[PDB]
Design a protein around this ligand. Structure first.
Ligand SMILES: Nc1nc2c(ncn2[C@@H]2O[C@H](COP(=O)(O)OP(=O)(O)O)[C@@H](O)[C@H]2O)c(=O)[nH]1
Ligand SMILES: [Mg+2]
Length: 290
């Protein structure tokens, strides 16, 4: 059987230091990580494990690939994120008795596991003090054909509504702060629960609908870079025939290679930017899909 896990390179600005944790049961030094709970997404699990093992709050940024290791019951697969500390503090807990803060070169020597060192090498290979644009395909909204009315008004269905609620923890894990939706009800409804969590308004985006993108993709590209250039971490909720075009165009331009890809309803692209440059493009499946 395969156990799904998530973890992080937790870092702080002391000037970058990374957190290495000591687990006395095994007596080893490692990166924070643990198993996904039922219905949990990998990012939410990574943030939860950071808090349980380190005592810190953090904001996730770039994804740092995946580690696979054999366990008695089979295989454990761990997706890792860069995570900037935003608060809290370390007190000994059930898993961890010691935490050190080390510069990367010293952390490399401290780590027990070769695959943790590989994660740390990926961490240092690109900027970590990044801002984040979260491009979300709206949740499930039934069929165009079976809808009676202006399709622009077609609402999320029950599943899509549940996806919208499950995206709050997802997007909050990346420190979402500002909200944008294409001019379709199903796009606005997808981030309505996050708007309620942040107490922030959603900015309507007529250029980012399927019809507008089809007729003027250059206006859509320009609007995306404008939103991305503003302070904060924006969520942009749009449609299936817009997202691949925008993501592939930015990735090709920046020479960024996505490790995963897809376009499902309720999916998220985490676009990591440093000084205006795309440095990561991480596709996250919908919160209710593997
Ligand atoms: N190869 C490798 N083994 C690990 C790692 N982390 C834990 N283990 C080992 O895998 C087994 C299960 O530990 P772990 O996955 O941490 O689960 P838990 O301790 O049951 O929560 C133990 O034998 C650990 O020593 C790792 O990062 N790489
Ligand atoms: Mg383990």
């Amino acid at each position: 059987h395969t156990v799904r896990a998530a973890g992080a390179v937790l870092w702080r600005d002391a000037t970058v230091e990374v957190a290495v944790i000591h687990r006395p049961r095994y007596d080893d030094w490692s990166l924070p990580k643990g198993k996904l709970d039922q219905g949990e997404t990998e990012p939410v699990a990574a943030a939860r494990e950071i808090h349980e093992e380190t005592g810190h709050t953090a904001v996730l940024g770039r994804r740092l690939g995946r580690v696979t290791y054999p366990i008695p019951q089979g295989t454990k697969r761990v997706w890792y994120w860069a995570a900037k500390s935003t608060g809290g503090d370390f007190s000994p807990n059930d898993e961890v008795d010691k935490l050190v803060w080390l510069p990367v070169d010293a952390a490399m020597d401290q780590l027990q596991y070769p695959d943790d060192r590989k994660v740390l090498r990926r961490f240092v290979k690109r900027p970590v003090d990044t801002k984040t644009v979260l491009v979300v395909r709206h949740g499930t909204a039934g069929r165009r054909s079976r809808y009676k009315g202006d399709d622009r008004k077609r609402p999320l269905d029950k599943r899509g509504r549940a996806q919208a609620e499950a995206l709050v923890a997802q997007l909050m894990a990346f420190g979402a702060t500002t909200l944008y939706a294409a001019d379709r009800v199903r796009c606005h409804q997808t981030i309505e629960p996050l708007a309620q969590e942040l107490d922030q308004l959603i900015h309507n985006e007529p250029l980012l609908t399927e019809e507008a993108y089809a007729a003027d993709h250059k206006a859509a590209r320009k609007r995306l870079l404008e939103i991305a250039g503003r302070p904060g971490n924006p969520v942009i909720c749009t449609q299936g025939k817009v997202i691949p075009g925008l993501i592939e165009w930015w990735c090709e331009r920046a020479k960024v290679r996505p490790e995963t890809t897809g376009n499902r309803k309720g999916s998220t692209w985490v676009l990591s930017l440093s000084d205006g440059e795309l440095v990561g493009a991480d596709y996250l499946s919908p919160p209710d899909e593997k």
